[PDB]
């Protein structure tokens, strides 16, 4: 079966600066019919895939004019004149020349931008949820850059790490920032036996932790 290789794995680029992804096949993709059946594809987080390019170079209508595709035989590249936030996603090359169809592994595209500090928000347990015997304290860290970050929880000044679950988003489709969720789960009994709940973020936009909190 025919083998597709994309490089790089992750491409990171300054806005306005041009981008190139390279796709290599284990075997020529020139079909016996004179046509080369090499395609490009885009999958934005949580989205279904979207055709970008077919037949090496023919650009889907509905796809902005900054995308181009070229190459021949086993070597192919996708170019973007200048990258925008809406281009962020994962880029697959795939081949229809030889059965079975095979896909590259994906190239994740990334945008550089100016540093931004997280907007931090903290939320105590829901009344509804308390009734049913559980307690989740929630913390959102939204619209920050760069990616690199971390979160610490504190109950009454003491650190807590059991019962903590975090989730992250990929770069935002308009502003190129990252956002993060952190959730602390307790029993109602444990939750009620303390007063002070603190959520705090470590990020290069600040020399000290950026802190949000509440008392009952």
């Amino acid at each position: 079966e025919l083998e597709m290789t994309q490089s790089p794995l992750t491409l990171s680029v300054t806005t306005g600066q041009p981008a190139s992804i390279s796709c290599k096949s284990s075997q020529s993709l020139l079909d016996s019919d004179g046509k080369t059946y090499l395609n490009w594809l885009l999958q934005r987080p949580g989205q279904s895939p979207k055709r970008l390019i077919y037949l090496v170079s023919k650009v889907d209508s509905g796809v902005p004019d900054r995308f181009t595709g070229s190459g021949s035989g086993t070597d192919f590249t996708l170019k973007i004149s200048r990258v925008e936030a809406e281009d962020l996603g994962v880029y697959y090359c795939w081949q229809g020349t030889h059965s079975p169809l095979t896909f590259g592994a994906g190239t994740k595209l990334e945008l550089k931008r100016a540093d931004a500090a997280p907007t931090v928000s903290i939320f105590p347990p829901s009344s509804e949820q308390l009734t049913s015997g559980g307690a989740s304290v929630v913390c959102f860290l939204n619209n920050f850059y760069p990616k690199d970050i971390n979160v610490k929880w504190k109950i009454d000044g003491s650190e807590r790490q059991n019962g903590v679950l975090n989730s992250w988003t990929d770069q935002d489709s308009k502003d190129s920032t990252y956002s993060m969720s952190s959730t602390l789960t307790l029993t109602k009994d444990e939750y009620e036996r303390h007063n002070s709940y603190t959520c705090e973020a470590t990020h290069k936009t600040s020399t000290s932790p950026i802190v949000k909190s509440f008392n009952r």
């Binding site: 697959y92 829901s126 949820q129 989740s136 939204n142 988003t169 956002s179 969720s181 959730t183």
Partner: protein
Amino acid sequence: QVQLLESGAELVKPGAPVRLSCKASGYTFTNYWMNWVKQRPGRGLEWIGRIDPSDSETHYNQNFKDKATLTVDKSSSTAYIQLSSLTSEDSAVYYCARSGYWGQGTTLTVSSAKTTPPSVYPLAPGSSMVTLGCLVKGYFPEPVTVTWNSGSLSSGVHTFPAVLQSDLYTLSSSVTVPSSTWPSETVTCNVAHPASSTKVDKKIVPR
């Protein structure tokens, strides 16, 4: 315009069979091959096979042989894939696709566990510009879908990937909006869990 309506999710038990569908419209069903592709969460794309609806000419990727069977019903413009004796290795998103257009995909989960609808919890501030949210807790299987004010509120929204804790899924979503517009005007969480055919709405009330 063109579209390929797939079902959102299906839970089934090991060893069982299942039949996934892909209702087409907006074009002549019989004039385009229908492909099926499999994507495992976090993982990459794998081609399963394809079928010509006019005469039912059918190709398979040999890796999916006997595992997967393709059909259509011209009468209804629908394409099917039939999967036999399931295993957790088959748990994945299954996309149907035609030249230029991909379906929304059906998340197939293969597990002996019960469908567990989510509990939904509002996230309001305790006290310019305000962040509210929704905690979608304790569901199975994936996926859930969240909107705000049935899709009218889509700007400044952040919906996070789900975490798995103790064989149940949890996720949350934040929405940021002017203090002007809330709680002055209603703000509501909309949560779908297609595997249990469940819908839940949560009005964010002030705390």
